[PDB]
Each structure stands twice: as structure tokens, then as C-alpha cells.
């Protein structure tokens, strides 16, 4: 089982009519992968880890020697897929075998012709550059000529079948993002490549779009914009155009079947809403509706990024109105009243009303500079609703446990932006964050993070306004 | 080796009579002469053109 199947794999290389023997080797590779994945003991996991990668004989050297084999593709493809599985099956100690894998990845890409193996020879290499994002054990991967060749392999005939090209754009972006240190100079060429190709995809009265290419271009551009920001004040052309492309990639189609361009466009928007500063105040209404739409999409990963993009959008426009809210009276009123629309409307949703409350809390602070009274007009109806909902009524049996952290972050946010505390609800304030504590184990990850955000946020808010109410942080911690 | 075409175009008010219900004969003449000249100029031949205007 261990190191003997690999031995048979290298033994069956020279057998004549390596077609049935090809299937036997492929089955052996499948069994090896199944065995290694089934392995649960970390000690034997590292043992087989060292076992598979050996210079004298192994699958790595097999791929390095089976290069000139047309029929050895499905076996090569199976080995590459197993390598992709392994690179995340185990930890971050691939190092002694990393660089050669990367090298062989390029080899198993730069010679193999079938796109069924050109994809894994990009999946494995993207995985390698993601799991060694740290500079250590990584400068052995020369980003220089890697970028050079994977950027020169798209200056040629319209050959590569729009899926390998998708992964190529993803990898160019990732090179822009992981290790941004050597490619300080050629990122302009990569930006111009991304914008030009995305242009051709979104402006043509010919040729129904290569949607995988559009998704790859957008996600790669997102990654490249990390560490290579173009804020919307220095060069006011490329940021306009990137945001225009993001709009068109998230413009609401009446009837589209595949959701891959909206996913990557929404993830770009979520990551980099701050990047598009002044472009993000013109059609904000339509952005609001489209973000609610894709929050209500009933997909699996389209909502996961639509909600993040909506959150970042509201966050950025809140941080924006909170600067010069003189001509932002109308926009402020619109946002807060649409949050009222989300929260007073009778909807059977869960993550819907958890948007209005958080937007309420974010937009609270910009209200202190328009009224200085609505920080108190709010935060009272907010605590009053908290008391009605999850202090007295259906305190035990209901579904209203999901939407407590939103209340708590909103409360803390308006709390910081509110001087001369009403000081009659503070007992209920502490009685509310204690009971946010009480219900932490009946939640899920990625709100447990946000619930911890709410708890530290309330703490850091009430604790920064003199010792009188910082005396209640002791009481709340004690009661929790 | 080369041929010369010398067109003539009437432009007068009667030629440019306001639309009797379909379209103007003068503008039809304009369309046809534009077809002729565009094909001649895009054929790169040495078939010269001399244009004159009457009813001016």
C-alpha cells in the first residue's frame, strides 16, 4: 500500500502497449489518494507525505518523466488532482517539496496540451501561491518569470479555451496579490490587460460573452487590486472604468442562468468599495436594490458575497456621509427610511432585517451632525424594540435569536456617537449585552466572529466615556 | 488604360421639391451619386471623376 503502488506505477512506465497498464496505474493512483485522504493520524500522514515525494522514485518524478506521453493524461490528471487535494489535506509544511511541485506544475502545464490537465496545472499552482503567501519558503518561486510566461501565454492566437484562460487571469491577479514585492513594475501591464479584456467581454455586438473568462478576469483584478490600490483620487480614469465594469457585472439581468460574474464582481466590490470612492455616490439607490435582490437570491455562494458587498457598501457610504453631511441630508434620509422599510415590513426572511439594523447603527453617527438629537431619538426605540423582542416576549420559544448581534452592534455604534447618555436605559443596555453573551453557543461561525465584534464593540464604546458607566462593564462581565 | 466619368447634378428648387409624399428625387440623386463615388474611391482605380453642378 505504502510506496509499493508508486513503485508499480514507475515499473509500468516502460511496458509495451501502455493502455491497459495505463488504467491499472490510474486505479493505483486513485487507491493511493483514497488511502492518504482516509489517513487520520498526523504522524502517518507526515510519513506518507515524505513517502510520496522522493527524488529516486515517486509520482513527482513520474510526472517529470511521463511528459512525452499522449495517452498518459487521465493518469497524469488524476495525479494532479490528488496533488491539489493533498496541498490542503495537510498543513503548511510542504516547503521541502514546494518549489519542485511549482516547477513541475509549470512543466505539467507547459507541455501537456489537454485542457483537462492544463486546469489542474493551474489549480495546484494557484493553491501553492495561496498557501505560501508568506515570504519565507516562497522567494524560491521567482514571481518574475512566472508572471512573464503566464502573461506571455495570452499574447497569441485565440487558442486557450476560456477556462484555462480564466485560471490564468486568476493566477495573474494572485501573483499581483501574494508577494507584491518583485512585480512593482509590471502591474501596470497587468491592469491594462485586465481592463482591456474585460472591455472586449462587456462591449461587443458579436460573440456571446465568455462568462468564465469574465469571472476569471474580475477575480484576478480583485486580487491584483490588493497591494496595488488605485484609490479614486490619483488617476481618475482607471477607477471609473473598474467600477463601471463592476456595475455592469452586477447589473440586474431579467433572466440569466449562471451566477459567476455576479459572484466575483460582488466579491471585488466587497473587498474594495473604499477603492471606488466618488463613483460610489451617483446611482447608490440602484446599488441598494440590486444588493437586496442578490441577498434574497436563494443561492449558496451568491448570497454569501452579496451580503458582504452590501455590508461594505453601507459601511463605505456611512464613512462617506460622516464627512460633509450638508448636501447628504437627502441621501441620509433615504438610507435611513429604506432601513425603516426593511424593518417595519412583514417579511419571513432572516438576514433581511439584520441588514436594516446594522445600517441603522452605522448611519447613526452621521445623524449626530444633522440633529444631535436623533442619536437619542434612536437608541431608545432601538432599546425599546430590544426589550419587547428578547427580554419579555418570545424570550424562550421563537426564531428571533439570529438578529440580536445586529441590535448590539447598532446600539454600540450609536452609543459612541452619543454624549450625555440618557442614563435610564443603561441597566437594560448591560442586561442586553449580558444576554447576547447568554446565547452565544446557539449560533453559527462567522456570526460568532461578528457577535464577538458586537460584544467588544459595546465594551469599547461604553468604556471610553468616563468611569461612571465604565463601572458597568465590570457588572456586565461579571454577569456574563 | 484609364476611363473618365463626368457626372452632372441638378440641385434646383424643382429638383429639391418638398416631399410629395415619399422622398425627394434630388436626395435620391445624392444617394446614387454617393454610391458611385464611394465605390470609385474604394476601388483605387485610375478612373477619374469630374463633378459639375447646375441649377445653382
Amino acid at each position: 500500500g505504502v510506496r509499493c503502488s508508486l513503485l508499480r506505477l514507475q515499473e509500468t512506465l516502460s511496458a509495451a502497449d501502455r493502455c491497459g497498464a495505463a488504467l491499472a496505474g490510474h486505479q493505483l493512483i486513485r487507491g493511493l489518494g483514497q488511502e492518504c485522504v482516509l489517513s487520520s493520524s498526523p504522524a502517518v500522514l507526515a510519513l506518507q507525505t515524505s513517502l510520496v515525494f522522493s527524488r529516486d522514485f515517486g509520482l513527482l518524478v513520474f510526472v517529470r518523466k511521463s511528459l512525452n506521453s499522449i495517452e498518459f493524461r487521465e493518469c497524469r490528471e488524476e495525479i494532479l488532482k490528488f496533488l491539489c487535494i493533498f496541498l490542503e489535506k495537510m498543513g503548511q509544511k510542504i516547503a521541502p517539496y514546494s518549489v519542485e511541485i511549482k516547477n513541475t506544475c509549470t512543466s505539467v502545464y507547459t507541455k501537456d496540451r489537454a485542457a483537462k490537465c492544463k486546469i489542474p496545472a493551474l489549480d495546484l499552482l494557484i493553491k501553492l501561491l495561496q498557501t505560501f503567501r508568506s515570504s519565507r519558503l516562497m522567494d524560491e518561486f521567482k514571481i518574475g518569470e512566472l508572471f512573464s510566461k503566464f502573461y506571455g501565454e495570452l499574447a497569441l492566437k485565440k487558442k486557450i479555451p476560456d477556462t484555462v484562460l480564466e485560471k490564468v487571469y486568476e493566477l495573474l491577479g494572485l501573483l499581483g496579490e501574494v508577494h507584491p514585492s518583485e512585480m512593482i513594475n509590471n502591474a501596470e501591464n497587468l491592469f491594462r490587460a485586465f481592463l482591456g479584456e474585460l472591455k472586449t467581454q462587456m462591449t461587443s455586438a458579436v460573440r456571446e460573452p465568455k462568462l468564465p473568462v469574465l469571472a476569471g478576469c474580475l477575480k484576478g483584478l480583485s486580487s491584483l487590486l490588493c497591494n496595488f490600490t488605485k484609490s479614486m483620487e490619483e488617476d481618475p480614469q482607471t477607477s471609473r472604468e473598474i467600477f463601471n465594469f463592476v456595475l455592469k457585472a452586477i447589473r440586474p439581468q431579467i433572466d440569466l442562468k449562471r451566477y459567476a460574474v455576479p459572484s466575483a464582481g460582488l466579491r471585488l466590490f466587497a473587498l474594495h468599495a473604499s477603492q471606488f470612492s466618488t463613483c460610489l455616490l451617483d446611482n447608490y439607490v440602484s446599488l441598494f436594490e440590486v444588493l437586496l435582490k442578490w441577498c434574497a437570491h436563494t443561492n449558496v455562494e451568491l448570497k454569501k458575497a452579496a451580503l458582504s458587498a452590501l455590508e461594505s457598501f453601507l459601511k463605505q457610504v456611512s464613512n462617506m456621509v460622516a464627512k460633509n453631511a450638508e448636501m447628504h441630508k437627502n441621501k441620509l434620509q433615504y438610507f435611513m427610511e429604506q432601513f425603516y422599510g426593511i424593518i417595519r415590513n412583514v417579511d419571513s426572511n432572516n438576514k433581511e432585517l439584520s441588514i436594516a439594523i446594522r445600517g441603522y447603527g452605522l448611519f447613526a453617527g452621521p445623524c449626530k451632525v444633522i440633529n444631535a438629537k436623533d442619536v437619542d431619538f434612536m437608541y431608545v426605540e432601538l432599546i425599546q424594540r430590544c426589550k419587547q423582542m428578547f427580554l419579555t416576549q418570545t424570550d424562550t420559544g421563537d426564531d428571533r435569536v439570529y438578529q440580536m448581534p445586529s441590535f448590539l452592534q447598532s446600539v454600540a455604534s450609536v452609543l459612541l456617537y452619543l454624549d450625555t447618555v440618557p442614563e435610564v436605559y443603561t441597566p437594560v443596555l448591560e442586561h442586553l449585552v449580558v444576554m447576547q453573551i447568554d446565547s452565544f453557543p446557539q449560533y453559527s461561525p462567522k456570526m460568532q466572529l461578528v457577535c464577538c465584534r458586537a460584544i467588544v464593540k459595546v465594551f469599547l464604546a461604553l468604556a471610553a466615556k468616563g468611569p461612571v458607566l465604565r463601572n458597568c462593564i465590570s457588572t456586565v462581565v461579571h454577569q456574563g | 488604360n484609364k476611363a473618365a466619368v463626368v457626372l452632372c447634378m441638378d440641385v434646383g428648387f424643382t429638383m429639391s421639391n418638398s416631399i410629395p409624399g415619399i422622398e425627394s428625387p434630388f436626395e435620391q440623386a445624392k444617394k446614387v451619386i454617393t454610391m458611385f463615388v464611394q465605390r470609385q474611391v474604394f476601388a483605387e482605380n485610375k478612373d477619374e471623376i469630374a463633378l459639375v453642378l447646375f441649377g445653382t
Binding site: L67, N68, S107, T110, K111, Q201, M202, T203, S204, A205, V206, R207, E208, P209, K248, A249, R251, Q253, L256, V261 | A3, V5, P20, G21, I22, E23, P25, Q28, A29, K31, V32, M35, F36, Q38, R39, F42, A43, E44, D47
Partner: protein
């Protein structure tokens, strides 16, 4: 409106002065030239429907000279003139550099990388061509096949025979052009020689299977030479014809011997009325000769005319996007209004009367089209937009 293969004046488009002007001009130009002048007259609608503005300006193709050889003795010097062949755009869309607009400021290349671990470049002079033969390749290279290739024995218009029963049917012409052989100059006896040949070939149903090569370099083609049938000249038209490898046999299931597709006589007469509604031919002026409604063999190519006007617009106006296709083009490429008006009804009679146009699950959308309490009661009593 623009051109419709039909009438010119809408209801009454003539006046007395216009009629007399037409009379005097036609009389003067007839006396100057003759009946050919009256033959050469058109409107602004068909001159946009025809190439009539382009006459006697372009030149004859080539008087390609060869000889009709029957056996080794019956020789007839001939000049073939090239007849129908597809025309094409004579300019290449030249690649340039973006935003600097210079043709020389770009240069492509071609590098023959090997199937090795990288782009292990090799030079041009160390690459010879192969050929597929089985599972491997044959190092044929170049000079070798330029020696042991077929040799053509020069340009040859030698007749391979004749045939009465026309197995040479139009569904087998295989060509890319049509040739038309008349005569030569220089004491035209060969004129009447081949004229005798074709006046023998025309009256009785025989054809002329012939061998033809353009020159020494060109490959030889066996074709059929149907005899010319016109009054002002008498030619021997020539057309290429398949070789044993060219023509394919495709078994298609029969229709007369088909059951589940059996058409009812109701359908037959329905499409009878459909055909007679949209017939493009008729008889008139008591001449017992058919007229040519929608004669698709005289109107120009919309391709290069639309290209001409598109490039005109983009050349004068470097900013505006591509224009739309003219209305007169779309009138070129549409049947006359009379047939459509006579047509709408049997069209719908078929629409209902025939089985359904069932399956429709296809879309070809372009990129630009896919990404571009008491207080409340007191208030109610006080104010109300509606009433009652």
C-alpha cells in the same frame, strides 16, 4: 420608398413639361446612339438596385489564349474569357498599433518551440514538413515533393470526348468560376471552326467533356463544356467537375416512401396557394414571355456596399460608432411588396393548417445585450386622500 422591384411613381408622378422633356431628351439621345440608348435608362430606385451607373468603364478580364485540341489534328486556337466568379474585397484590414496609429510600429513573428520542458526554440532552417500516413508522420519536406510531384505538360484545353446523355447535371459543377470561349483575333478561322463544333453540340443534346489547366503550375481539371445559347455571340461555356474523391454518397431516407410524414391534400393545396401567391414570375404585355420579378442576378452585393458606407461614416466622423444598415439596402434584399401583400393570408393558413413549430429553446444574445389607538384614528378622521 427606395427600391422594390416594381413601380416608380406612387399614383401620378408625371406632368406635361416632364413628359415633353423626357420625349425630347430620349429622341435626341436615340438619334445620337440608337435603341441601345433607350435600353440604357433607369430610375433612382433601380440604379440603387443595379450596377447600371457602372457600365463600359471596367475592362475585360483576360483573353486567356489556348487551343481546342481534338485528337492531335483538329486544332482550334481560342481565347477563353473568364466568366462568373465571386468578387471580394481588394483591401486588407491592416493590423496597426493602438493609440499611435503606425503600421510599421508593429511586427509579429513565428517561433517553433519544441515539445520539451520549455520553449526550447529551434530555427526555421532545421524544420522540415511531415505528412499524416497512418499513426506516424512522413518526412516529405519540400524539394523532394517539388521533384516527385505531378507535372502538368503546360496549359492544355484538350477535349477528352463528348456525351449525348447529360450525366453532366448542374448539381455537379464543383467549380469556382465559369469559362466562356468565343474565338480569337487574327484572321478568325478558328472562330468558325469551334462555331461548327458548338453548332453541332447545341442542336443535339451532346456535351463536351474537356481537360483544362490554367498554366504549367496549375493543376488539371476535367469538366463539361455546354454549348452557348445566345444571339449576339456563340460560345462554349466550360465548368469544372468532380474527381472520384470529390463527390460523396450520402444515404438519405426517402420522402415519397415515408409514412409518418404523410401530407394531406389539404396541406398540398394550401401550399399550392402559398406558392402561387409568392410566385416571382408572370406573363404580361401579350408577348407570351415571362418577366423577372425580383431578379436576384442583377442587384449588387450588400456586403461591400454596406462596408463602403460604414467606412465612409467612420472615416469622416472618427468618433461616432458604427451606423445602421441603410433602409435602401434592406429594400434591396426583400421581395416586392406585391408578393408579400398577396402572401400574408396563405402564410397564416399554413401557420394554423400545418403541425406546430414546436421546439424553441435557443438564444444567441450578444455581449452588449447581456451586460448593457386614537391618535392614528384622529389623523384618519382629519386627513384622507380618498373618501367614503
Amino acid at each position: 420608398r427606395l427600391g422594390g422591384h416594381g413601380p416608380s411613381f406612387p399614383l401620378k408622378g408625371i406632368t406635361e413639361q416632364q413628359k415633353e422633356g423626357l420625349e425630347i431628351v430620349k429622341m435626341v439621345m436615340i438619334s445620337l446612339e440608337g435603341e441601345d440608348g433607350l435600353d440604357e435608362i433607369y430610375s433612382f430606385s433601380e440604379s440603387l438596385r443595379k450596377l447600371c451607373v457602372f457600365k463600359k468603364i471596367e475592362r475585360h478580364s483576360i483573353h486567356w489564349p489556348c487551343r481546342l485540341t481534338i485528337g492531335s489534328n483538329l486544332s482550334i486556337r481560342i481565347a477563353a474569357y473568364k466568366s462568373i466568379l465571386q468578387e471580394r474585397v481588394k483591401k486588407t484590414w491592416t493590423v496597426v498599433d493602438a493609440k499611435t496609429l503606425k503600421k510599421e510600429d508593429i511586427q509579429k513573428e513565428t517561433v517553433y518551440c519544441l515539445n520539451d520542458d520549455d520553449e526550447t526554440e529551434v530555427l526555421k532552417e532545421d524544420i522540415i514538413q511531415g505528412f499524416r500516413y497512418g499513426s506516424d508522420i512522413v518526412p516529405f519536406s519540400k524539394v523532394d515533393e517539388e521533384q516527385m510531384k505531378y507535372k502538368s505538360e503546360g496549359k492544355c484545353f484538350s477535349v477528352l470526348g463528348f456525351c449525348k446523355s447529360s450525366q453532366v447535371q448542374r448539381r455537379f459543377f464543383m467549380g469556382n468560376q465559369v469559362l466562356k470561349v468565343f474565338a480569337a483575333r487574327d484572321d478568325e478561322a478558328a472562330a468558325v471552326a469551334l462555331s461548327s463544333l458548338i453548332h453541332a453540340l447545341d442542336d443535339l443534346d451532346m456535351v463536351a467533356i474537356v481537360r483544362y489547366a490554367y498554366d504549367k503550375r496549375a493543376n488539371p481539371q476535367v469538366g463539361v463544356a455546354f454549348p452557348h445559347i445566345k444571339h449576339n455571340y456563340e460560345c462554349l461555356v466550360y465548368v469544372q467537375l468532380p474527381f472520384m474523391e470529390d463527390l460523396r454518397q450520402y444515404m438519405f431516407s426517402s420522402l415519397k416512401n415515408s409514412k409518418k410524414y404523410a401530407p394531406t391534400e389539404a396541406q398540398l393545396n394550401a401550399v399550392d396557394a402559398l406558392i402561387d401567391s409568392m410566385s416571382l414570375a408572370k406573363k404580361d404585355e401579350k408577348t407570351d414571355t415571362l418577366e423577372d420579378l425580383f431578379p436576384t442576378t442583377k442587384i449588387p452585393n450588400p456586403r461591400f456596399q454596406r462596408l463602403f458606407q460604414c467606412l465612409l461614416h467612420r472615416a469622416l466622423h472618427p468618433r461616432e460608432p458604427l451606423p445602421p444598415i441603410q433602409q435602401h439596402i434592406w429594400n434591396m434584399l426583400n421581395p416586392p411588396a406585391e408578393v408579400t401583400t398577396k402572401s400574408q393570408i396563405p402564410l397564416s393558413k399554413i401557420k394554423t393548417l400545418f403541425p406546430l413549430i414546436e421546439a424553441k429553446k435557443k438564444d444567441q444574445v450578444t455581449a452588449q445585450e447581456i451586460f448593457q389607538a386614537e391618535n392614528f384614528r384622529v389623523l384618519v378622521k382629519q386627513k384622507k386622500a380618498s373618501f367614503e
